[PDB]
Amino acid sequence: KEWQENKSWNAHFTEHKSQGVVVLWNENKQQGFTNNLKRANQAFLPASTFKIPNSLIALDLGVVKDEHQVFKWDGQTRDIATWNRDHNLITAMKYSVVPVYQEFARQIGEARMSKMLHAFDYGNEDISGNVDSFWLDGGIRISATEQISFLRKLYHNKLHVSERSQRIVKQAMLTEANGDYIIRAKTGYSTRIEPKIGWWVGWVELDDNVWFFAMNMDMPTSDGLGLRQAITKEVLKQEKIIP
Amino acid sequence: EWQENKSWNAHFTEHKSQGVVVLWNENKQQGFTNNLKRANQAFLPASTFKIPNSLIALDLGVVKDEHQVFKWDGQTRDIATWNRDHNLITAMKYSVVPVYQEFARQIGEARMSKMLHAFDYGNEDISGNVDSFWLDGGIRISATEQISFLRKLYHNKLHVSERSQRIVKQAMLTEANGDYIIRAKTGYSTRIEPKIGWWVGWVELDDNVWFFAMNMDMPTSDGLGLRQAITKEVLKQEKIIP
Ligand SMILES: *C(=O)N1C[C@H](NOS(=O)(=O)O)CC[C@H]1F
Ligand SMILES: *C(=O)N1C[C@H](NOS(=O)(=O)O)CC[C@H]1F
Ligand SMILES: [Cl-]
């Protein structure tokens, strides 16, 4: 089959009194796997996973020159300590620094953002709402399977932006690497509009294959945020993708 | 500019080993070593030569990109991971000599010689076979010369395309987590005394980069793990990694 439902993965959610979906895509076999085919195709606010396309657009338009360019703290002190400092594209991604990406979005502006998301075939392509918040409380919606379609294009340098912009964002997505695998990914937490959900989207690079992944889960409180990565890794371990 | 810290000798002594670690603090423009003399002694690069080889092969279009497949020739060699297909990422990870021998042949002596001059790489001498000179030929490079070369690569200042430099830095990816990223290449000079192990690269932190280059005497393959282990003991002592 091209898509396979594996309800056995539901145990990794229920074991934590959680609900959500993991979607995997085996690039060599062109085969997908999920615990929940319906939720795999349900569209949600992307929240901080939108830093991938936002970074790409900012780079391709020269809003961001390169991964070294420094974005000065605005002096407004905020809840998350790591945000109250200067950043570059690498640290802004790592610490998911909202204010930096709000400024990128304002400099990209409404018209270029809407055109680029259409060029990317990104989710419902709807940027209705505030130009500097629509991915957290506007009209944009993307499903786990749509996140995978977008990430496969980025992985292959097939998005309609320069190869250089694609290579810089994939560098900035680096999360973990050892002698067994490389993960390039981005977390999100949709907190403003119900339902509150966590995201983790990206891919696992092996020696001879790539496994794309997109997961979301109900996230009523920040208490469960570590389960985004932990449930994903339980599934990757079950499927013998990582040791 | 250069500070000798003989207190690091304990990390070699403790493992009944001899060698040099060179660190470079990019933000402060300050270098540190256990041994100024050995830091400036030139050795065969062995598999550390895969960095400049990769760069030249990408810049000339001998390698199209990091996905291009180099087919196994069906000849069983001693290192099991070599006996299969590779791309640039796995060829570097497993240090696959046959792949790089073929790159060196397609590049040719003339283009190889000019590019190592452009890189100011070691003694820029490619005497010996086009496809072994880094293991038993004329090319030699010191730990301090590795750092100069790596700093250029890190900044995209080598005389090759930006694209070539980014692709090789991707191929050098060795380890990453929430505290650091290491981009590096191992080597083992086995043919001509002194038999040594290399580990060269850098540690990316949020707010700085620490370049490193280490070699150590390696009389048998037993000690190869010490290249990374001793380097990490020094990085942990200097509070660079936890
Ligand atoms: C993004 O989804 N953000 C920014 C910040 N943290 O994001 S992340 O899940 O840690 O990557 C707070 C949640 C939301 F506003
Ligand atoms: C290069 O140094 N090589 C190739 C191979 N392994 O190299 S490495 O130390 O693992 O990078 C065997 C020794 C030497 F010929
Ligand atoms: Cl990378």
Curated annotation (Swiss-Prot), chain A:
Q: Which InterPro entries match?
A: Bact_Transpept/Beta-Lactamase, Beta-lactam/transpept-like, Beta-lactam_class-D_AS, PCN-bd_Tpept
Q: What's a Pfam family in this record? A: Transpeptidase
Q: Where is the active site?
A: 48 (acyl-ester intermediate)
Task: Look up keyword Signal and say if it applies.
Answer: yes
Chain positions recorded as a beta-lactam binding sites: 48, 51, 96, 228
One GO biological process term is:
cell wall organization
- What are the record keywords, sorted? Antibiotic resistance, Hydrolase, Plasmid, Signal
Q: Which domain of life is it from?
A: Bacteria
What causes induction of this gene? Expressed from an upstream promoter, P(out), in an insertion sequence IS1999.
A GO CC term assigned to this protein in UniProt? plasma membrane
- Name any one GO molecular function: beta-lactamase activity
Per the UniProt entry, the effect of residue 48 to A is: Does not alter thermal stability
Extra facts: When OXA-48 is present in clinical isolates of K.pneumoniae, increasing chloride concentration during antibiotic treatment reduces bacterial growth.
Family the entry assigns: Belongs to the class-D beta-lactamase family.
What does the UniProt function comment say about this protein? Class D beta-lactamase which confers resistance to the beta-lactam antibiotics, including amoxicillin, and moderate resistance to cephalosporins and carbapenems such as cephalothin and imipenem; in the DH10B strain of E.coli. Acts via hydrolysis of the beta-lactam ring. Has oxacillin-, cephalothin- and imipenem-hydrolyzing activities.
Subunit: Monomer. Dimer.
Name of the protein in its database record: Beta-lactamase OXA-48
Which organism is this protein's natural source?
Answer: Klebsiella pneumoniae
> Lineage, please?
Bacteria, Pseudomonadati, Pseudomonadota, Gammaproteobacteria, Enterobacterales
Gene (name only): OXA-48
